Amino acid sequence: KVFGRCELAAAMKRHGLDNYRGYSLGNWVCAAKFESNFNTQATNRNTDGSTDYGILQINSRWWCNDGRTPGSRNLCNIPCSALLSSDITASVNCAKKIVSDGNGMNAWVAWRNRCKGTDVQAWIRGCRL
Ligand SMILES: CC(=O)N[C@@H]1[C@@H](O)[C@H](O[C@@H]2O[C@H](CO)[C@@H](O)[C@H](O)[C@H]2NC(C)=O)[C@@H](CO)O[C@@H]1O
Ligand SMILES: [Cl-]
Ligand SMILES: [Cl-]
Ligand SMILES: [Cl-]
Numbered sequence: 001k002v003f004g005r006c007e008l009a010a011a012m013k014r015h016g017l018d019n020y021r022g023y024s025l026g027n028w029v030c031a032a033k034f035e036s037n038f039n040t041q042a043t044n045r046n047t048d049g050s051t052d053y054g055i056l057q058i059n060s061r062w063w064c065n066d067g068r069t070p071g072s073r074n075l076c077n078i079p080c081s082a083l084l085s086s087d088i089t090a091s092v093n094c095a096k097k098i099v100s101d102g103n104g105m106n107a108w109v110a111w112r113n114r115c116k117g118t119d120v121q122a123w124i125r126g127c128r129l
């Protein structure tokens with residue numbers, strides 16, 4: 001599924017991401033925009049052979065099992081394919097674990113490079129939340 005911006009904002013808000021670990025909702029929407037262009041089915045392969053999955057491009061090196069990232073962890077205890085669902089629950093719940101792990105949203109490269117330090121509230125501007 002390709003979410004609309006506000007649709008995703010609302011979904012993320014419903015799933016408890018607004019101000020989760022201090023990260024306002026726009027951070028999460030911004031991260032999703034730049035990680036996946038709001039596409040739950042996005043996948044990208046990393047240089048190490050892991051793959052990033054879903055709307056928040058959660059990687060299989062650490063967070064999910066895709067059966068083809070040897071030596072990896074599955075810290076969200078999910079098949080990576082669960083992160084491609086139109087239902088963002090699995091991605092959100094995994095993202096909550098990630099963002100809680102001490103590095104905050106810096107885990108999301110796109111967030112660090114394209115959202116961090118910007119006016120992320122713009123990403124939820126106009127949305128009914
Ligand atoms: C939370 C999450 O999974 N974020 C993704 C990053 O992990 C991806 O970065 C890449 O991650 C792999 C596995 O750890 C690293 O081997 C790789 O070096 C790293 N790539 C970069 C440029 O840092 C990122 C890839 O775009 O996608 C999500 O942000
Ligand atoms: Cl868009
Ligand atoms: Cl915000
Ligand atoms: Cl694996």
Ligand SMILES: [Cl-]
Nearest residue numbers: 011087088089
């Ligand atoms: Cl959802």
Ligand SMILES: [Cl-]
Nearest residue numbers: 021103104105
């Ligand atoms: Cl933080």
Ligand code: NA
Nearest residue numbers: 035052057110
């Ligand atoms: Na990415």
Ligand code: NA
Nearest residue numbers: 060064072073
């Ligand atoms: Na894994």
